[PDB]
């Protein structure tokens, strides 16, 4: 009964324009409202704006107010909003969201969509970690791959997802050329030096590359 | 009616509305109960007087100062004997086209002032003794308007409070003032939005005239979000007023008895006419000024300026204003081709003093930057828009455009707007400033001194703040007008593009203001009324717009015809010409007796004593702008008005004014549509490509001597 | 033009705790005030609305409090699907803002982490980089200290903490250091020591090895 | 560097006229040109119109009008003596309607030169006792006027009544108390915002490079100060007194 569909959101080098939809399936627009919303990954919430198709009412927030644009079809009760002059802080996961009846009632929420804004698209570099004899202290090692310069994350897995117990993926870093870079380890047994080599998996969704890397003393 | 016609299906509802000029306004309409038995204490002239308020602290004051609200009306609509209306009509601006909730919201604010200070009293007594003198002093009335309305309260009203009508009230009622204010609701809102940008959107169209609205009524949100956001900001009630006077009495005539306005001071800075109220007695007074300036009129650019200047700088102390026009004073400020025009009208209190900070305030003035911006873009919105009005107004246009010396036109007026910075502007205004002339006319219960010192004040504050120093008597100059070649007739045409209706103008330079020509014009004009009023709308039912008349320009009389039609233009041309032959039938048609009523009329036509001090400030105002002076040119005239006879018109229609004529000076404008018994051969006229290349071989008329 | 004060940043407490989370607004509001949850990867939730009111499909262990300025979520007792980001926000006309977050963890013993570290690959050496990552495992809580050691001479300013979140299995946290230099500094610099203190490991250890 | 090489006599082309034609017209410029049929020298002479509205308002814009081109020409003069030196002469005068502008002399550096005195007089900067010496030297030369022979007294009261406007010596002589130099410094960029420019081209060139070289100066002068045409409704003469 309540449906919000937000799709559209891509990939953009940064000072373009773009243009993103909510679809507000179920109910009207002509009804209570909807809202743009900012979430930054790893960091907090912005409001960004809030149209009421049913008084052409627009609101927008202070900062960036004036260079986008927002509209809305009520014939399908849906909204838009143009985007423009795109910079490199505003590549997050973006929602669109309903206020229902209410004083500060914002109950439903949307899909969410994808905000990409960088200079380049790379694939990685993998290096794989090399435990060796001097890493060999107790009862306790691990073994892990260096994944370098690349550019939307990597899903990583072992042996294509065989031991997936120890296994921590550190979340990557978006460096000074726009690429990303992280290393995912998993902990393994002493009696696992040299027995078995496993092969950290790349699997970079946008670049479509996909390096299986062999970890080896 | 036991009912009211807002019966909850429409309450708490939103309307759309696309209008027909492009303006942005939103309603607000409240149905009400019966005050009509409430006349005794009457709150709702109160709560008018409270609503549209503009006072510190007020929030049309904030609103302003936010820049949000152009202007607005709210208060009491009349209805029927069972209920009544209760309306709010306010303009928007950009933002105030996006906030609309929020300015609802500002509404609420002032309803939460209200509610928090409650009923006032001080208030009502102020304001009641401020009906009190305005009921108190009153001249004498206009017998037309005056007996309609008091005959609409005829009904309602003992024979002894026909007079005392509502301009006295017995008690306070808070209890009342409270339970409308409680009628004053979310729960009560009617909302009527006006935008353009309606477009695909409003299906519901109007059956008579065809507007289009759509319902879409607000969700509960916003309405539940209205009552419990219930909050006082930065509001303040405003405060006593000061500017009540005890002057009240009559000064007794000196021995300077003048019927007329003497030059009581002359300066090369300034000009002073002066003449006391002799019939009306009041202690009232009337104050004209003209600002001279030759750089008024040099280029679009600066005259463009100097509207926005004057324009932005009366906004500025209007809200300070606002007691004053609410206490009786009037004013008016206004630019001219030549310069600005200050008039000054009410009560002998406090003029000098209010004055001296209106000549500080235009003298010492700053300026904010998107107040720049919006005045700006709203004139440059009222330029544009000067591409769709009616072809009366139209020709208009163009008649004083071409019967002047020089004239700037609005396309050049829309295109140098686009280098307008505030730099250049604040900059350039006291260079402008820097030295000019005022010439002023001042009447009503005052001595000659104390003009004298008025005056004085004036200019003393203008040299103390711009060191202004006065103007060469080289540049005192006037504007011109167009010479002809003495036979020739020219026409050309302008295509309306929106009105289906086509326009033209005929004009008709007679000859300068002699005392002959003016009598020759106004008989004439006076005969030709009544069989054109006959014929031509009337029975040719041609249009509605059929007028004729006078043009007193430049120190020249003229004649001038103005006719708006929907016709072929020289089918028009036709029967305006068989018109001609009509009237030149009717010349002759005349009798002795209708000469003589038909004089009579004209003379108790032009002859009477005046029914208002601005009535006839107006008319010396317009000698003063022509700079004519002659005072007794009435009786001058009606002793020239009985030495008149029939052949005297014929040998001034021969010559002058007929179709054989060497001294014709005939000339026609078309204004096109949108997709634009005996007729003899007109002469060929030529299309007019540039009216400066029009002129151009044209010469130009002398000026008048001055009487 | 009111900002928010979400106090305190965070905490850590178990399944069945009393969990009172206070946000202060810089101005006198009135209670215009949402509560929030979002878990990790998922649409975020209306606990609380109006500051005071409970949105209706929703549990009420949870309560909202207007106190002035004081507004304050309290928690009866905690659950294990509650471990999630929290927010507040003021609405008005006014561009609505936020909190600070405050990610709700658990209460667990001191765990000390297992400290590595992982010389750079032989090809990494060939494109004349070396990257040399010291790794934290198993500690309890995130709140540590990893400063890295070069021939035991302190280094910053090229490395970076990338430390996980509450374990799904287990409720510890991964640390992982990376030192990052140019080939120049590998076979300069043998001793690549990775001195650790985390609140376990009050005492810093120093995990180093020569090549 | 004004010793010229250019010495080479253009033969005449399809532009076989005895008069100027109007070889380039636009809404901010009008061009007149005509080679040298019967002379065929080197040398060339150019005539140029400054048209602006500005010159006859007040005394104060004459005043200034007359101090700008006069401080202005004496600016670039100390340059200019190897130029008149090498046999090129030139005038700068100011009218009641506007500035004149001659180039005189041979076919070398005329483009050369002209855009460097383009370049000069749109961007120029003031000293404070240049402005002095200029200002009261200029007022010795307004009360020298009442003392000078009688026919130049008589054809100064002949072209006083029969024009349209005219602003007397004597409130010019009264209106140098109040000039100052910054309300001269900011009208001036005022004064050039706006004008006409009307040139005659004479000499030893071609159609083409005429074309190119009135090109160059109308592009400099949009260049600096963002010059726009004029309006032929402000486009004004006086007429004469009947």
Known sequence: ?217 | ?707 | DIQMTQSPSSLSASVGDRVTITCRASQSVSSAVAWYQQKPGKAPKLLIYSASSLYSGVPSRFSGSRSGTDYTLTISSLQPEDFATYYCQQSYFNPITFGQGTKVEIKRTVAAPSVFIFPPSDEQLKSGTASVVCLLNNFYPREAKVQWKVDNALQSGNSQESVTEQDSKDSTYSLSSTLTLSKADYEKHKVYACEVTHQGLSSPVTKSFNR
Not at chain 2, 627 to 636: A, C, G, L, S
Not at chain 2, 656 to 682: C, F, G, T, W, Y
Request: with cysteine; net charge neutral; charged share 25%.
């Open chain 1, 1 to 217: 009964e309540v449906q919000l569909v937000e799709s559209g959101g891509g990939l953009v080098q940064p000072g373009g324009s773009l243009r993103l939809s909510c679809a507000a399936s179920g109910f009207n627009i002509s009804s209570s409202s909807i809202h743009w919303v900012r979430q930054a990954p790893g960091k907090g919430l912005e409001w960004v704006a809030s149209i009421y198709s049913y008084s052409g009412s627009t609101y927008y927030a202070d900062s960036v107010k004036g260079r986008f644009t927002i509209s809305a079809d009520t014939s399908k009760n849906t909204a838009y909003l143009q985007m423009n002059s795109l910079r490199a802080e505003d590549t997050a996961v973006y929602y669109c969201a309903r206020h229902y009846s209410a004083v500060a009632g914002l109950d439903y929420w949307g899909q969410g969509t994808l905000v990409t804004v960088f200079n380049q698209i790379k694939p990685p570099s993998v290096f794989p970690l090399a435990p060796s004899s001097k890493s060999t202290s107790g009862g306790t090692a691990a073994l892990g791959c260096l994944v370098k310069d690349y550019f939307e994350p990597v899903t990583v897995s072992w042996n294509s997802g065989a031991l997936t117990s120890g296994v921590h993926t550190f979340p990557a870093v978006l460096q000074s050329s726009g690429l990303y870079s992280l290393s995912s380890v998993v902990t393994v047994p002493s009696s696992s030096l040299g027995t078995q080599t496993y092969i950290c998996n790349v699997n970079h969704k946008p670049s479509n590359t996909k390096v299986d890397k062999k970890v080896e003393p």
């Open chain 2, 1 to 707: 009616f036991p009912e009211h016609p807002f019966q909850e299906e429409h309450l708490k509802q939103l309307y759309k509305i696309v209008p027909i000029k492009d303006i942005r306004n939103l309603y607000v309409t409240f149905p009400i109960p019966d005050l009509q038995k409430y006349y005794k204490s009457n709150p709702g002239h109160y709560l008018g007087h409270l609503i549209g308020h503009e006072g510190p602290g007020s929030l049309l004051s904030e609103l302003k100062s936010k820049g949000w609200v152009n202007t607005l009306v709210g208060g009491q609509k009349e209805g029927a004997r069972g209920f009544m209306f209760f309306i709010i009509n306010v303009d928007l601006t950009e933002e105030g086209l996006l906030h609309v909730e929020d300015i609802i919201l500002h509404m609420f604010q002032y309803i939460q002032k209200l509610r928090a200070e409650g009923p006032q009293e001080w208030v009502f007594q102020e304001l009641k003794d401020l009906n009190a003198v305005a009921f108190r002093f009153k001249d004498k009335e206009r017998p037309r308007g005056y007996t309609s309305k008091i005959a609409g309260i005829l009904h309602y009203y003992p024979l002894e409070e026909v007079l005392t009508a509502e301009y006295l009230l017995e008690e306070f009622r808070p209890d009342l003032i409270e339970m409308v204010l409680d009628k004053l609701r979310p729960e009560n809102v009617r909302v009527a939005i006006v935008s353009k940008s309606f477009e695909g959107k409003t299906d519901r169209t109007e059956e008579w005239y065809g507007t289009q609205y759509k319902q879409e009524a607000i969700p509960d949100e916003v309405i539940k979000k209205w009552q419990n956001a219930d909050l006082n900001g930065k509001f303040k009630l405003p405060t006593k007023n000061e500017f009540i006077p005890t002057n009240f009495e009559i000064l007794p005539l000196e021995k300077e008895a003048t019927p007329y306005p003497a030059l009581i001071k002359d300066t090369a800075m300034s000009k002073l006419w002066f003449k006391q109220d002799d019939k009306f007695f009041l202690p009232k007074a009337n104050l004209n000024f003209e600002f001279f300036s030759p750089f008024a009129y040099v280029d679009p650019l600066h005259s463009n300026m100097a509207y926005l200047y004057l324009e932005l700088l009366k906004d500025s102390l209007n809200e300070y204003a606002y007691a004053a026009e609410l206490a009786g004073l009037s004013y008016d400020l206004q630019n001219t081709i030549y310069g600005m025009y200050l008039s000054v009208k009410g009560y002998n209190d406090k003029q000098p003093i209010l004055l001296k900070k209106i000549i500080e305030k235009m003298a010492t003035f700053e300026i904010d930057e998107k107040r720049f911006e919006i005045i700006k873009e709203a004139y440059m919105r009222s330029l544009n828009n000067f591409r769709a009005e009616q072809p009366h107004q139209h020709a208009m246009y163009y008649l004083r455009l071409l019967m002047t010396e020089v004239a700037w036109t609005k396309d050049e007026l829309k295109e140098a707007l686009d280098d307008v910075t505030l730099p250049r502007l604040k900059a350039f205004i006291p260079q402008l400033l820097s030295r000019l002339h005022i010439e002023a006319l001042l009447h009503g219960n005052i001595t000659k001194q104390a003009a004298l010192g008025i005056m004085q004040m004036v200019e003393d504050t203008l040299i103390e703040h711009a060191h202004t120093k006065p103007l060469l008597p080289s540049q005192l100059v006037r504007y011109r007008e167009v010479q002809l070649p003495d036979r020739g007739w020219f026409v050309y045409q302008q295509r309306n593009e929106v009105h289906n209706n086509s326009g033209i103008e005929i004009y008709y330079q007679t000859d300068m203001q002699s005392t002959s020509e003016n009598m020759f014009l106004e008989l004439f004009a006076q005969i030709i009324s009544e069989p054109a009023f006959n014929t031509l709308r009337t029975k040719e039912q041609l249009g509605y717009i059929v007028f004729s008349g006078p043009r007193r320009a430049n120190g020249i009389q003229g004649l001038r015809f103005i006719i708006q039609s929907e016709k072929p233009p020289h089918y028009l041309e036709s029967r305006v010409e068989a018109f001609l032959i009509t009237m030149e039938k009717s010349i002759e048609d005349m009798t002795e007796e209708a000469f003589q009523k038909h004089i009579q009329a004209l003379a108790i036509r032009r002859l009477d004593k005046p029914k208002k001090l601005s009535a006839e400030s107006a008319k010396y105002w317009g000698e003063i702008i022509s700079q004519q002076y002659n005072f007794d040119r009435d009786n001058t005239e009606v002793a020239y008005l009985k030495t008149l006879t029939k052949e005297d018109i014929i040998k001034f229609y021969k010559e002058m004014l007929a179709v054989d004529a060497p001294r014709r000076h005939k000339v026609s404008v078309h204004v096109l549509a949108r997709e634009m018994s005996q007729a003899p051969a007109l002469p060929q006229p030529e299309v007019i490509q540039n009216m400066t290349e029009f002129k151009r071989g044209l010469p130009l008329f002398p000026l008048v001597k001055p009487h």
